[PDB]
């Protein structure tokens, strides 16, 4: 489970800060478990891609 | 990043309208469609090339593929007369680009 | 509901300056980036600037780069656009529109538009 | 980490109307998104990954 997320095999969703700029966007821009999306009560589908490696480790930090 | 869009589209009450805005690589971009009636603020009617917001009539349907992205309004009322604007974030130069606007005419 | 109000427009001399405040309400102003668009009196929409959900990334058009400058204050729920060295062809209707995505570095597309403040520039 | 999991406070995409803020869906035409399980997201993902 530590070697798995090194390969990126654990698709743990990155958290959307909601108060600090990130690499979020819409569904279409995800391409350029693919990405994790939210529908805020005052916004469109905000989608942030899972990291290609250390997704679980990056989430835990 | 030029976003070509027809200067005008004329339809009849009951028919359908297709406003087709086209870029070089519009298939790889998030096309948003806004509606702006005369003397009013533009209104988002299509997002993510197809996601219709809340309250927008379900007759409105966007599309995006290849070099062109189209907005189709089916069974247009006389209250659909407005200017419809494409909008994409060109990531190569990091700039938002609007289309030329298509003045819909519903006779 | 979600509603943006622009302020600070009006007639200015050719070469003057303005700061269009944009008070947003009905939404979490801290989580969404604010665009700035202008529409010439009879022409199409023209993107003008964008500022991220906190202010880290700010983008400008090439015709206004080095003259216009976005800014914001999430505590006061406002967004500003300092427009310096305003030219004659700069008269338009300026809208501030919130981006539709939380904490996005790029303004992929507006969600709620402002009312639009009419800026005129003439002797 | 498993108590952190049974509370469903770590979102793992299993392997569509959408929904720091926890993302509530994972997406791959329209935007089709599978919801993330409320509790034991990692456990269910591991159970399906080996099955």
Whole-number Å distance between alpha carbons of A24 and B47:
15
> What is the experimental method?
cryo-EM
Q: For this experimental structure, what is the resolution in angstroms?
A: 3.1
Pairing state between β C18-19 and C21-25? unpaired
End-to-end CA distance of chain A: 16
CA atoms within 13 A on the CB side of C52: 20
Whole-number Å distance between alpha carbons of C104 and C11:
34
Instruction: For A28, name the nearest residue in chain C, comparing CA atoms only.
Output: C108
- Residues shown for chain A: 61
For D45, phi and psi rounded to 5 degrees? Answer: -60, -45
Whole-number Å distance between alpha carbons of C96 and C6:
7
Pairing state between β C117-119 and C92-95? antiparallel
Nearest to C86 by CA among C7, C8, C11, C17: C17
Instruction: For A13, name the nearest residue in chain D, comparing CA atoms only.
Output: D11
Tokens standing for residue C58 = 């700010």
CA distance C47 to chain B (A): 6
CA atoms within 13 A on the CB side of B107: 11
Whole-number Å distance between alpha carbons of D24 and D30:
17
CA distance C97 to chain A (A): 12
Region at C56 (left for phi over 0; alpha for psi -120 to 50; beta for the rest): alpha
Whole-number Å distance between alpha carbons of D8 and C8:
48
CB contact (8 A) between residue C54 and residue A20 = yes
For A39, phi and psi rounded to 5 degrees? Answer: -120, 90
Look at residue D47 and give its three-state secondary structure: helix
Residues of D14-51 as b/e, b for ≥16 C-beta within 10 angstroms?
eeeebbebbbbbbbeeebebeebeeebbbeebeeeeee
| Residue of A5, A23, A38 best to disrupt the D interface, most CBs of D under 10 A | A38
Whole-number Å distance between alpha carbons of C84 and C69:
8
* CB of C113 closer than 8 Å to CB of C4: yes
Whole-number Å distance between alpha carbons of B75 and C99:
30
CB of A15 less than 8 A from some CB of C: no
Task: For chain C, list the strands marked E by DSSP.
Answer: 3-7, 18-19, 21-25, 32-39, 45-51, 58-60, 68-73, 78-83, 92-95, 97-102, 110-113, 117-119
- D4, containing H or E segment: helix D3-6
Tokens standing for residue D26 = 């994972």
- A36, containing H or E segment: strand A35-38
């Amino acid at each position: 489970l530590v070697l798995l997320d090194y390969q990126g095999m654990l698709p743990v969703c990155p958290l959307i800060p909601g108060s600090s700029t990130t690499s979020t966007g819409p569904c279409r821009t995800c391409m350029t478990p693919s990405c994790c999306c939210t529908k805020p009560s005052d916004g469109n589908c905000t989608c942030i891609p899972i990291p290609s490696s250390w997704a679980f480790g990056k989430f835990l930090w | 990043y030029v976003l070509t869009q027809p200067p005008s589209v004329s339809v009849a009450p009951g028919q359908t309208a297709t406003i087709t805005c086209g870029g070089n690589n519009i298939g790889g971009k998030s096309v948003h469609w806004f509606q702006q009636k005369c003397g009013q603020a533009p209104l988002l009617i299509i997002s993510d090339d197809n996601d219709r917001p809340s309250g927008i009539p379900e007759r409105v349907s966007g599309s995006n593929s290849g070099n062109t992205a189209t907005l189709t309004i089916s069974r247009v009322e006389c209250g659909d007369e407005a200017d419809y604007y494409c909008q994409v974030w060109d990531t190569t130069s990091d700039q938002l680009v609007f289309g030329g606007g298509t003045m819909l005419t519903v006779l | 509901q979600m509603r943006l109000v622009e302020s600070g427009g009006g007639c200015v001399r050719p070469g003057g300056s303005l700061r269009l405040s944009c008070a947003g309400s009905g939404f979490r102003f801290t989580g969404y980036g604010i665009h700035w668009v202008r529409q010439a009196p009879g022409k199409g929409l023209e993107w003008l600037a964008y500022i991220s959900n906190d202010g880290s990334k700010k983008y400008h058009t090439d015709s206004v780069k080095g003259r216009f400058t976005v800014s914001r204050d999430n505590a006061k729920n406002t967004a500003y656009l300092q427009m310096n060295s305003l030219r004659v062809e700069e008269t338009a209707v300026y809208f501030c529109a919130k981006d539709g995505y939380l904490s996005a570095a790029r303004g992929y597309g507006m969600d709620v538009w402002g009312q639009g403040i009419c800026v005129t520039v003439s002797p």
